[PDB]
Point group: D3
Amino acid sequence: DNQHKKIKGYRDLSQEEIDMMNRVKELGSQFEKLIQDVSDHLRGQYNASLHNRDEITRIANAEPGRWLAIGKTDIQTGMMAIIRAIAQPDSF
Amino acid sequence: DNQHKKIKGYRDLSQEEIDMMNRVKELGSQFEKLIQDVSDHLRGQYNASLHNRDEITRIANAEPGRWLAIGKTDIQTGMMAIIRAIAQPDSF
Amino acid sequence: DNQHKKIKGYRDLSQEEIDMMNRVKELGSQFEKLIQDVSDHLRGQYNASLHNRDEITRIANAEPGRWLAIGKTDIQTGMMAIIRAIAQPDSF
Amino acid sequence: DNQHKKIKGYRDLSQEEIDMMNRVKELGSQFEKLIQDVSDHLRGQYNASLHNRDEITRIANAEPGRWLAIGKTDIQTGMMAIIRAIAQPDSF
Amino acid sequence: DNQHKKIKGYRDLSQEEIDMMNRVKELGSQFEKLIQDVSDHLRGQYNASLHNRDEITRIANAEPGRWLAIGKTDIQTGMMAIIRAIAQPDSF
Amino acid sequence: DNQHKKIKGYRDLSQEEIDMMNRVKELGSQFEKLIQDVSDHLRGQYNASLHNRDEITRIANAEPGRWLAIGKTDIQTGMMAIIRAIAQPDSF
């Protein structure tokens, strides 16, 4: 109970602060859907491109999945930073 | 004219691809508004907290603006990665 | 009260989980002290090197403060990631 | 022998500089132990949670190992930056 | 046709701008070759070190491939940033 | 003297290893020149665009210098990672 007070640096937060943190998380959920949609497109692209070695080689050289992964991480890490700015913890 | 064909690795893109790239950019615009809103909150917080050295010191230790900045960069860099996954260029 | 339950994705945490999160934060505090110590060294180095244009130019080309800053951010962002691994939130 | 003088930008270092670089590396070793401990916890959590599909799905959605990995990289990259600030090389 | 005008924020570019963007991409190609060369060295090192458990353990602890991967990503992401600085898009 | 042996994790290196590390550093020097050239272009662009508020606002919204800075850091951090892969230190 009241876990936050047991965590170093965590401070009591206003409703306004929580609302903002929650908004960032909600916008992120919309990004997640987009990321899933891109993944779906890539999977279809690979399937449709089966038997075209030349296109398969192009997809492999492009590395689209790695790039989608790099992006997800970035969106997520960024969300955490905006949330940290709102939360303003007292620890390093 | 047709600048893209003058850029190494850039390839002709489908409408479907452009639509997706544009969607990422549009979602990012929504993040930009949120980022601006957080900045506004922080500015107000500083103003209201003027004359409370203790709170001003807390805000300074928290470094909220640096964190908002780190987040913007991350959201933006990530967007570029998702776009790269959609665009699939032919260059390293 | 019970702010966490008002935040999307946050889940009830065990004492064991909190202890671990707190340990990461404590180790980070030790890094903060080191970072401050390096900053102190750099400041002294600049002072002692005043009137040696050649050394001042060397420090400026090296960009030590930027590098210390890049490191602090990295240590901190990493701490957040380990904490996220321990906390295991239910949101993206 | 004297490899450093064969590496571009590397410069002769004071004992004080080496001591500081070594301290960062030693603190990092303490982080490594923590990272290993978190990994151990996660492995146990997965084992104990075997046969609870609902919990296994929760762990998978959380992606704790990816997050631990992101953190290790960050701690390590940051250490390198602090070390670079201490070492102050003469190369870009 | 004229895909760029269909992409949000993309703007007409001068030849001078394209030339610079292309130069960054060309320099990156040189990095790609180096990265491939390092990978080749690592593969040879592993082969030659087969049957020396002690050396194999050393390579594994070092994690050279992960580090090469982290570097490729960084070089590439950076290239994109320099290109963004040259291109100057009108979107977030 | 023999500083490297005084640094934790640093190991004796082959000429082949040093040559490769040096090559990465040399390629980086070429990137530095490009980065300086882009900076020069941006400065000229700002000068020539003085008295065109509309263009000045465009440059400011674009944030080209921040982006060049993000890129330099990335190129540099990446170089360090490739070098780490070649050097293979024995420390975390």
